[PDB]
Swiss-Prot record, chain B:
It catalyses: 13,14-dihydro-15-oxo-prostaglandin E1 + NADP(+) = 15-oxoprostaglandin E1 + NADPH + H(+); 13,14-dihydro-15-oxo-prostaglandin E2 + NAD(+) = 15-oxoprostaglandin E2 + NADH + H(+); 13,14-dihydro-15-oxo-prostaglandin F1alpha + NADP(+) = 15-oxoprostaglandin F1alpha + NADPH + H(+); 13,14-dihydro-15-oxo-PGF2alpha + NADP(+) = 15-oxoprostaglandin F2alpha + NADPH + H(+). The gene is Ptgr1. The modification Phosphothreonine is found at T22. The keyword Oxidoreductase applies. It comes from Cavia porcellus (Guinea pig). PANTHER family: PROSTAGLANDIN REDUCTASE, PROSTAGLANDIN REDUCTASE 1. This is Prostaglandin reductase 1.
Length: 331, 333
């Protein structure tokens, strides 16, 4: 018997504005031996996500940061999760974790070795499912429509654009760098603009689509959303997925949208949470995402930070827009 | 047969509104009308509407133009076979006492109109605002029975109809209005709860007090900060019908902070704007017949806030925006 030392990232201090390296503190803990019905997990790939900026509020200062990871079962006294098997675990930022099967999800069966397991945290996982349902259910695209997506080169945004493309939609993206814009055009976005460098957001959205937009997949909220409303087609739909423009500054209230746009254009605005879709419909969506990736219809890119010690940085840099595609940390 | 000249009075927009409208923004003009040509009719205003939309629509006017709006008018004289002298029409002829029409923009009054119902109802409960309430509640909110419904400006033209249709459809209704008199009126016509949003110590407390289980639909007539407060009270997958936003009409370019993304996402709320004119033809006509039936059955009680005299019309409009009116604001010429 050898002692397993689990390293964990803790919330040393609550976030003020943008998170900093010193808001985090590593702890090391010797784990106990497994009881029957339990497994020992070792992190392979750990996700960092925007929601961690929000969820960190409810944490008691000193607790382990929340999050999902892909982990290998090292030791098992649980027959549902044999040693060597791979699981999705809501175990937070930790190198090793003991579970009784509680928050454990088996990866899609028939998972191809050609596909990196870290895709289970992105395109073929929660962000991909958010994109799938937000676009296909909330916006309800069926072909011919013009779709705008913000944070277009991120984990959710990249999938939205490419699914909208395969559905026969015209797709416009807004992202935060020229490199991101170059990438977006090369994966099928019909138009893409850098939102930081616009002369006028109004004219940028006008140039991208002079006839306006059928669907806005909103990842950023704030004043971007407000400007978008003025350019929605009548009876247009806005899927409120996130509001990242207002996560680092939840204290500073964003100015009101135009009642004129919402009323005159008779717009529909709908917030959604990915977890709303369960059972058969969720499994089918995961199979769809898997198939579209295997068919090269959803290209993927992962923004990989190598090393568990670098996990705080990966999260900070992702919030600031360093990532093209899903931000993932390898142990 | 000797003919006498007709003098038409009109209220013009002297100056575009800046913040709250005032009397000085309006200028009365008197025009001697030409004789009727063949195909034309002379109309005399009976009842003229004042409405919130006029605060926004005014921005498109050229200064010196007649203020826009709908009226119930009588055909005084007619050289148009389609419009008999003595018949009653609705016309979007604006704030004017008399006008000449070639028939183009004239809506014949709803047939089978009973004497016992004041014609001015055609501009409120059995008219545009009643249709707004009808479709806003039944089609946008989509009530089926059992829902808890919140309505702002509850004692106004639209709001009073909303609450009463909701009660006859089997819903629980909560109203917010700006005076104690209005609150007592709301309770009297069947609202389950009603509160004065101006005088309550906390707006959030009053909403939780009125409905602990929260709200299935909010029929929003006011928007602004009031709407922001309501979202925290909404039920999961609740609906907000964006009918109007009167609390911001005076400050469209200086808006207050907007809705909470947390509330909209976390509760998965559905917000929809709508325009009453979306519903036309048979669906619109049936809605009107339904409204009249429910009025005649006593399921929809009405009150009108009547201003006597055309020269009092700008004041009627100003005070309606300021909340003087219980029920539909209307000017009797
Ligand atoms: N409703 C749901 O169930 C659900 C689920 C998952 C995610 N979400 C939401 O979806 C959004 C994207 O999530 P993700 O996981 O795909 O992350 P992501 O897009 O891969 O990463 C976040 C990106 O947002 C952009 N960003 C950061 N600050 C911004 C700001 N000030 N204004 C505009 N853009 C900014 C950055 O890219 P740029 O270079 O383009 O600025 C950054 O790369 C988030 O808002 C998240 O909360 C919602
Ligand atoms: N979408 C459409 O097709 C359509 C059609 C018709 C009407 N509307 C809208 O529906 C709303 C009501 O119309 P209406 O014709 O029935 O007018 P109304 O309610 O009869 O009269 C306006 C009322 O708004 C209230 N109000 C004024 N300022 C306010 C403020 N700052 N905060 C909260 N309430 C305020 C006042 O009542 P209180 O005493 O309660 O404050 C006032 O009596 C308006 O917003 C209008 O634009 C929309
Ligand atoms: C426990 O199931 C959920 C469901 C949805 C959630 C979260 C957790 C968290 C994390 C948390 O618990 O705070 C976030 C951030 N969720 C959002 O979708 C969201 C996104 C943007 C805004 Cl603005 C508000 C909410």
């Amino acid at each position: 018997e050898f002692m397993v030392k689990a390293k964990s990232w803790t919330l040393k201090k609550h976030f003020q504005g943008k998170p900093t390296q010193s808001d985090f503190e590593l702890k090391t803990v010797e784990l106990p031996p497994l009881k029957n019905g339990e497994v020992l997990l070792e992190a392979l790939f750990l996700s960092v996500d925007p929601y961690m900026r929000i969820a960190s509020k409810r944490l008691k200062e000193g607790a382990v940061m929340m999050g999902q990871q892909v982990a290998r079962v090292v030791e098992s006294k649980n027959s549902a999760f044999p040693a060597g098997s791979i699981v999705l675990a809501q175990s937070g930022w930790t190198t090793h974790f003991i579970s009784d099967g509680k928050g454990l999800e088996k990866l899609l069966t028939e998972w191809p070795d050609k596909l990196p397991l870290s895709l289970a945290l992105g395109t073929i996982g929660m962000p991909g499912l958010t994109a799938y349902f937000g676009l296909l259910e909330v916006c309800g695209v069926k072909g011919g429509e013009t779709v705008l997506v913000s944070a277009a080169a991120g984990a959710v945004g990249s999938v939205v654009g490419q699914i909208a493309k395969l559905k026969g939609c015209k797709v416009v993206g807004a992202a935060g760098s020229d490199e991101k814009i170059a990438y977006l055009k090369q994966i099928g976005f019909d138009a893409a603009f850098n939102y930081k460098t616009v002369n006028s957001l109004e004219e940028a959205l006008k140039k991208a689509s002079p006839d306006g937009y059928d669907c806005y997949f909103d990842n950023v909220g704030g004043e971007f959303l407000n400007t978008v409303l003025s350019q929605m087609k009548d009876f247009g739909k806005i899927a409120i997925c996130g509001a990242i423009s207002v996560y680092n500054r939840m204290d500073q209230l964003p100015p009101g949208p135009s009642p004129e746009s919402i009323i005159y254009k008779q717009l529909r605005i709908e917030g959604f949470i990915v977890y709303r879709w369960q059972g058969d419909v969720r499994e089918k969506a995961l199979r769809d995402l898997m198939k579209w990736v295997l068919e090269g219809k959803i290209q993927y890119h992962e923004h990989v930070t190598k090393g568990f010690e670098n996990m705080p940085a990966a999260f900070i840099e992702m919030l600031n827009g360093a990532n093209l595609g899903k931000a993932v940390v390898t142990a």
